[PDB]
Write a protein that binds this ligand. Structure first.
Ligand SMILES: Nc1nc2c(ncn2[C@@H]2O[C@H](COP(=O)(O)O)[C@@H](O)[C@H]2O)c(=O)[nH]1
Ligand SMILES: Nc1nc2c(ncn2[C@@H]2O[C@H](COP(=O)(O)O)[C@@H](O)[C@H]2O)c(=O)[nH]1
Ligand SMILES: [Cl-]
Ligand SMILES: [Cl-]
Ligand SMILES: [Cl-]
Ligand SMILES: [K+]
Ligand SMILES: [K+]
Ligand SMILES: [K+]
Ligand SMILES: [K+]
Ligand SMILES: [K+]
Lengths: 109, 107
């Protein structure tokens, strides 16, 4: 299997198979409701979320990058913020869609 | 949008993503040569090897939303573990460390 950062989740190799379970810890992802976790890029509204992911150039250009070492190895750390356009005609739906998936695991039944 | 921009010799890292610096939403990555070249940089493929796919970006990161006087911001934090079994591991560690906070050494 490809290095983690190059994995593409789909129904056949889903979000928790490729990127681990959702949770509150620093090395855990917190994004994705039950539908997105199970479907990955097969998720119907996936393109509306992917529009906000950065290109390789923007990931290294916009982010604060670091290099940390832990008992498990060497990690490339990254942090940043992407400004949405609150004048985009779909701004209201984009906010609803992102929030729907942000910390969705906290209310899984 | 800014997150889909591609920096090149004609539209460099500073023009596309702002000057490097120490602040929280300020990019700190790139020596003068990478800032000048962007994706045209001699070792750009070795750097792009660490950039996440859209799926890994939303799968690995801690995503949030912050609404302030400047707008609505999608925040992100995470860490990508290097594979110490990758034959390029030594070069990857040296290359990343070279460009992290390189701006501190020049105007
Ligand atoms: N750091 C950062 N600045 C941004 C982003 N989007 C827009 N800006 C800033 O927003 C300001 C207003 O310009 P505009 O948004 O109309 O292009 C600019 O000075 C620009 O740098 C973003 O995602 N990140
Ligand atoms: N959160 C996180 N865990 C990772 C990453 N790469 C590997 N791991 C985890 O690190 C452990 C060691 O696996 P290895 O990749 O060294 O065979 C496993 O628990 C694996 O899931 C990564 O980029 N992020
Ligand atoms: Cl561009
Ligand atoms: Cl190269
Ligand atoms: Cl060098
Ligand atoms: K989970
Ligand atoms: K790119
Ligand atoms: K460290
Ligand atoms: K939408
Ligand atoms: K993808």
């Amino acid at each position: 299997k490809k290095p983690r950062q190059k994995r593409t989740a789909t129904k056949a190799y889903n979000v928790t198979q490729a990127f681990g379970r959702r949770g509150p810890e620093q090395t855990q992802g917190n994004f994705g409701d039950q539908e997105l976790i199970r479907q990955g890029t097969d998720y119907k509204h996936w393109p509306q979320i992917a529009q906000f992911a950065p290109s390789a150039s923007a990931f290294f250009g916009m982010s604060r990058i670091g290099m940390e070492v832990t008992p498990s190895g060497t990690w490339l750390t990254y942090t940043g913020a992407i400004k949405l356009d609150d004048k985009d005609p779909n701004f209201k739906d984009q906010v609803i869609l992102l929030n729907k998936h942000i910390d969705a695991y906290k209310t899984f039944p």
